[PDB]
Design a protein around this nucleic acid. Sequence first.
DNA 1: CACGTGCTAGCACGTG
DNA 2: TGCGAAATTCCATGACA
DNA 3: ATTGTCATGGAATTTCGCA
DNA 4: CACGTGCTAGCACGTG
DNA 5: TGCGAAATTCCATGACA
DNA 6: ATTGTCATGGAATTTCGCA
Lengths: 163, 163, 365, 365
Amino acid sequence: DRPQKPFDKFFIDYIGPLPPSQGYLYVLVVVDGMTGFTWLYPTKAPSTSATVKSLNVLTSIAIPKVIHSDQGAAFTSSTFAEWAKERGIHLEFSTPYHPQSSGKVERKNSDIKRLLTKLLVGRPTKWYDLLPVVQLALNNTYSPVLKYTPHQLLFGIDSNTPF
Amino acid sequence: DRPQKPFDKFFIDYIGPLPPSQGYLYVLVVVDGMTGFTWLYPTKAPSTSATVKSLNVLTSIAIPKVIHSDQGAAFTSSTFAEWAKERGIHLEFSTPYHPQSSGKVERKNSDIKRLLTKLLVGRPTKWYDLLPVVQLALNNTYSPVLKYTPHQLLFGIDSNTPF
Amino acid sequence: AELDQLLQGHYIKGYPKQYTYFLEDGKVKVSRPEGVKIIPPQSDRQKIVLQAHNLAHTGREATLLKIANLYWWPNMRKDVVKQLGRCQQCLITNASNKASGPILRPDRPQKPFDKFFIDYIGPLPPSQGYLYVLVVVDGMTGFTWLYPTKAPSTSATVKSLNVLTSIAIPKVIHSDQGAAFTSSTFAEWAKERGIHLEFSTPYHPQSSGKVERKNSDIKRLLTKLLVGRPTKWYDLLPVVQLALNNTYSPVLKYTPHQLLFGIDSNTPFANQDTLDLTREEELSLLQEIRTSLYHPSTPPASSRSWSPVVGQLVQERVARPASLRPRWHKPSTVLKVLNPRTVVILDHLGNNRTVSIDNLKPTSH
Amino acid sequence: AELDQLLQGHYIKGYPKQYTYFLEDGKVKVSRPEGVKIIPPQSDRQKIVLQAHNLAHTGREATLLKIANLYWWPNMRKDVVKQLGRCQQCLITNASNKASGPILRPDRPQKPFDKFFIDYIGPLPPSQGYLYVLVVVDGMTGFTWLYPTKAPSTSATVKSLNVLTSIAIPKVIHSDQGAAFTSSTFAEWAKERGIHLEFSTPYHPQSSGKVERKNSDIKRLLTKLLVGRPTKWYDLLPVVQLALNNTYSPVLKYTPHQLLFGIDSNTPFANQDTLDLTREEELSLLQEIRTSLYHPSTPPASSRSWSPVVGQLVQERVARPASLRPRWHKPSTVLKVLNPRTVVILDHLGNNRTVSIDNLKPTSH
DNA sequence: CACGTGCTAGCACGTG
DNA sequence: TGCGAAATTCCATGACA
DNA sequence: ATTGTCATGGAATTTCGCA
DNA sequence: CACGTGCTAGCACGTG
DNA sequence: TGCGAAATTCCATGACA
DNA sequence: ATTGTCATGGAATTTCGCA
Ligand SMILES: [Zn+2]
Ligand SMILES: [Zn+2]
């Protein structure tokens, strides 16, 4: 229909378990559907409980029209569906075992998945502290398909920390 | 020489002892030489000590060129002469046993002397409390020789409590 | 859908014609220069306006623009202002953008001893176990008396004012509604001596301006005198009192002493200009000075001030508002307009209050 | 008696002739319209002026008139002003009658994330054992972040600003010289991330105007929301943050969200005007809005202001002056004039200080 | 004892 | 008369709260 | 039923000493 | 521990 | 065009300290 | 080495719907 924009769709997923860095065994991955921006939230478990804690911090900044995820327990709960409706966030669901995305999101969720793991052996079981730097790299990473960074597409200006 | 004015001369004297009203056995009488105004200060003894306490309260309002008194102990002390000089108050002294004044002051010191004593039997050994009313009457008393009150000559307007 | 005859092409007062009003999704839309907006019925507006305002309890414009994003109807602001007049929280928290009327400059009391102004300075630094000063300023002359007290009590106000009234009695005594002054004991003491107690409006110290502004000269000189020294001021009140009474107001050309006596006493730099006149020829001249003394007139009104009319909706600055609590009381009504600057209100409690317009803002809308 | 040739009838520059200068008591007198006054030698004047001034540490006129009572000489005021420039106590206590120069309106930061403004709101009413809020306002857009803290410590400022900088890093962070901000630990944290710390002049909160003025909207909305309820604000910072970022500044026509993103997110009354453009055609338009945004210019100077020149004598408002203590420090000198409104002084200690002219008065005489 | 009205304290943090 | 310097008046800006 | 005030010092302005 | 810098408490009195 | 009503812009006044 | 700001609502003013 009409052109893609940010906040149109946030793609979420958990990653873990990981090596216990200060109790945080998982990571919540939120990626803007159009700019491929990335937010990362260290959680202690992949529960609605901590999925809410985190998406609140996020939805205090900006609010997606749609959240899209796998049918992971945390995402399919009533708790979460109630939390969603409350804010006018539409829920969309990747039909089981056959994951769904646009090109962009598939690769970004990949970049992370691997970039996380490299700075998991290279800088070992103390990863918690580094998620902010990860997130910055991720959002300042250059895009082939659109020759602009997430930090550029999102804010419309150059990062003050280029990569 | 040149016409009489207020603050030109204050005439002072002690009166007592009197019936112990709250310890105050004496009264310091200060009368302006020209307006015949009267201030009254209850003291515990006719000492320089309490003559100073009292004339300070007075000389914080206004300051005479001259104080004139009998050769009473309190008045002739060094203490008092030092206190006087400090403020540029000239001391004058009624030559012993033959008291000195103008017409006006002689009668006013009389008015008081008697007016005090009437409200000493009529309202008995509790006089302290009444000195303010005495003082007001005294200063609002009408003058024959000049057809004006002390409160008129001093402030140049009618008292808000006429007598 | 009740005023929907616009869908057939009928005209309804206040709706422009050079547009086209269609239907989509089940909603009456309109094509606009701005974009394409949605017109809801009369029944659905009041609610929408509220929804919008409620987001941040926004003012007129900020509230409209949020609605601009989706809707158009005739004179939306008319509906929005209606709502801001009803929102309780906005009315009791938003400050005002209207300034008080210009100040009055009350006539100087006519004679010395017409009016007395009083206030208490302190607590101060403990000097000889005294902590406060009772300042007594005479209206007309500006002659000022200074009484050291151990507390600002009736108990001790009375004590001082007796020593004072030995000289004369005043017609009127004016003070801030300070505890010790609004006691019944003080009312007594004053009734007995037959003096009328006149009281400033609450939380409005310009009312006691004459004292406060003397306080200034009192604190100022005390300081200059206590430089480098530790602050023992008790023994200085005498020195200050005399000195101040005996200092010229430039715009008056006269010391308060002079305005009270017509000649200087025996104080440094004693003016002798009226030396040769009789006391009578001199006391007359004084009656003259007192009459033609410089007096200021009210300054011009501020471009955007307000003045109170009877039965107007008006709110009162909260006494001592708590943290995160609104700074204005529930709105109220003007009963009596004592002057361009003082008003008696049907209070929120729901008493009579005589308040200064300064502690008032006109209710908006 | 040295310039006494006037007794023989000789002329001395600055002394009028149409009077007659005689002798009485052993003092050189002069007959005047005012009356008959005493002229003392040059040697005796400075002392007399002092005697007179010292009575109440009086200003120019009030000091002269006391001397007028007894004396005349050529340009007495010339001698009197000389003395007021030397009296230490008057210079360090008398307030000023010269107003600051008109304010500067600093250019709005160019891009979002150029400048960050921070301050701490509180202490507040204990909500979930939190007592303060760290407010972070972006210069350009006015986008604002709200972090609940248990104290205004570096410890916890760092904590918050990390969560923040995950989105982006700012070039510059500006704050009041608040304890936690002027720590070395904070300098570190900022050096590490390579961000320049820029500091407001002391005791001058207009410098942090952007935050303070956002604080206002933050406290105001919090209150409207906590009416009738007990004040538990912790759970409301989220709600406030979003709402505020998403409320139109009337004079800008834009929400801070919009100035940061170019489209609204999924928040009530979502503006869709840029719906049909590509993200690229849209992000371009934003670069445009940001450039031509309304900006105020400095207001006109006050009739009686002052502006600082190098090497001028100037004094500094005492930090927190004691009771009965002077409100100004010993006079000092201007070294560098950073702008019409900020100055570096040879401090009284005797350091370098960068102070706002507001905390300065030009030394008189 | 809490409430209305006229005054100044007080506490925080980081550093020396 | 009119002109330069002195002297007096004007006033807005702050502190009392 | 009550109401702002006045020291202060550059600047503006009116008076003064002398022709 | 006192000092510099950015915040709100606090205490008084008389009356109900 | 030009006129009345609507709608948008102007701005000073306060609160953040 | 650093600098005041902006929601707000009557009032003033510029744009609009219709001839
Ligand atoms: Zn509201
Ligand atoms: Zn001095």
